[PDB]
């Protein structure tokens, strides 16, 4: 698999028993207590040596992965973000203020507020947006059957009793739009690629729940990428559009038995699982048609896992309790409901819903499941730890992160599309543009970075070579 992608996750943040605290201050402590160099364009905003961004957004600490090229790397650097958040909070506890800061990789307080886990995908600019919209809406409406993180409470305000597949569904209100904080659209239309806008669209997806499960994050990014390849190539000839897709989004979420039927415009009546099976079958045909059996292993793995998950969801979803967040969480919830005869309104069930996402290794419920061997993993912890400080090798995040590690004292600022150097003696800053996501890689600049012992030597060697190393 090769598609430039990334995940931005806003974390919930709680500072109990500190009347002097506010969410912006606590988010700043988290970002600042971890780190490094500033963001290039007054909130705390840091670029890390793994190429990630750590910053305060809307009174939430937010982690954005480096650009990666495949869904396994998306999982890996996204999981490293969880470790960075947990460590950041632990370091903030040693600041003079002494705050115990709790962080949650979820999307709602169950009281009407929501915050986002966004996926970004690089696409051909030429692909017509009307096709992007009409083929993605039904996919996004239904992919929560394996992407959902689970939620106790129905309706944005949480007043309805019961369990649902996703946290985000109740907050989406329209099909298409610019918004990210209110009246949220199934398809967000912002197109800000931080790359050659003549070549690339950046698809900014906002509808997904943050996932703890690595299998869920892998499927979320990997299946979406496969659907994007079909959309770009004009491969989908059928009409998957449904009547009232916003209503369908909510109704699919609110039926964890997975029997609710969408009403397709072409007359078909299909469950969300059934409609997902139609996308999967087209993806299989697409890959066979394009590559034969010359398919890369990861594409094959995504297709196989997508199919197995849908087959098991249709048979008995509880056999997925080691793979999907909403199933793993529901298994705990129903266990307590059976053991202690609890209605869905019980406060203990609300606590399980939230604490599932706590980043602490010793207290977060997903993390306890992993500790007891009750969750399947995709990557191992040693690789996650390495990904906290090393960038991916095959995107421009390589140059960004390695510059920060090796020449941090001489980096004035950095962003997705530039690194800005502050060289000794020069009374002027050197801005090195990194405009192509698939340049600035180890194959392009690794040897050069190895040889240079100073940022001055590096900027000298890069001078006039922008259209070699970076564009």
């Amino acid at each position: 698999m090769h598609r430039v992608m990334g995940i931005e996750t806003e974390y919930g943040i709680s500072v109990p028993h500190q009347p002097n605290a506010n969410a912006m201050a606590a988010s700043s402590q988290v970002v600042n207590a971890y780190a490094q160099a500033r963001w290039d364009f007054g909130l705390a905003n840091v670029i890390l040596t793994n190429g990630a961004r750590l910053y305060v957004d809307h009174a939430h600490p937010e982690y954005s992965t480096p650009e990666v090229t495949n869904p396994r790397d998306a999982v890996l650097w996204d999981k490293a973000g969880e470790r960075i958040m947990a460590e950041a909070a632990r370091r903030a506890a040693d600041l003079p203020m002494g705050w115990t800061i709790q962080l949650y990789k979820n999307n709602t307080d169950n009281k009407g507020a929501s915050y986002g886990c966004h996926e970004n995908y690089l696409m051909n600019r030429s692909t017509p947006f009307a096709d992007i919209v009409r083929h993605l809406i039904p996919f996004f409406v239904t992919r929560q059957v394996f992407c959902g993180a689970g939620r106790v409470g129905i309706g944005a305000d949480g007043r309805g009793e019961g369990f649902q597949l996703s946290q985000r569904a109740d907050f989406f209100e329209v099909e298409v739009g610019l918004e990210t904080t209110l009246k949220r659209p199934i398809i967000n239309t912002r197109d800000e690629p931080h790359a050659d806008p003549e070549k690339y669209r950046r698809l900014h997806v906002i509808i997904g729940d943050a996932n703890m499960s690595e299998i869920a994050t892998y499927l979320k990014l990997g299946t979406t990428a496969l659907v994007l390849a079909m959309i770009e190539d004009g491969f989908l000839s059928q009409d998957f559009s449904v009547e009232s897709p916003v209503g369908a989004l909510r109704a699919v979420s609110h039926d964890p038995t997975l029997r609710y039927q969408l009403r397709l415009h072409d007359g078909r009546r299909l469950t969300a699982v059934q409609l997902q099976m139609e996308y999967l079958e087209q993806a299989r045909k697409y890959v066979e048609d394009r590559f034969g059996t010359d398919v890369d292993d990861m594409t094959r793995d995504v297709l196989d896992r997508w199919e197995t998950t849908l087959v098991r969801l249709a048979d008995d979803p509880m056999q997925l309790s080691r793979d999907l967040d909403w199933v793993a969480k529901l298994s705990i919830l129903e266990g307590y409901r059976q053991r202690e005869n609890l209605p869905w309104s019980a406060h203990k069930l609300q606590l399980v819903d939230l604490q599932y996402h706590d980043v602490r290794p010793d207290r977060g419920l997903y993390n306890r499941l992993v500790a007891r061997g009750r969750m399947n993993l995709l990557v191992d912890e040693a690789a996650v730890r390495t990904a906290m400080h090393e960038p991916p090798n095959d995107t421009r995040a390589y140059f960004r992160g390695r510059c920060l590690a090796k020449f941090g004292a001489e980096i004035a600022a950095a962003s997705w599309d530039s690194v800005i150097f502050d060289l000794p003696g020069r009374d002027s800053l050197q801005r090195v543009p990194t405009l192509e996501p698939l340049r600035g890689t180890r194959a392009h600049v690794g040897d050069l970075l190895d040889r240079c012992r100073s940022a001055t030597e590096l900027v000298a060697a890069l001078t006039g070579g922008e259209n070699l190393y970076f564009q």
């Binding site: 939430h60 169950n110 904080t181 207290r363």
Partner: peptide
């Protein structure tokens, strides 16, 4: 359930106060 005993061991104290106090600013 062995696992429910593990979850019981780690759940936040004052569960009702904890849930009531978990109030977040809207994000994206």
């Amino acid at each position: 359930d062995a696992i429910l005993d593990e979850i019981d061991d780690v759940l936040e104290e004052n569960a009702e106060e904890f849930v009531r106090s978990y109030i977040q600013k809207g994000g994206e």
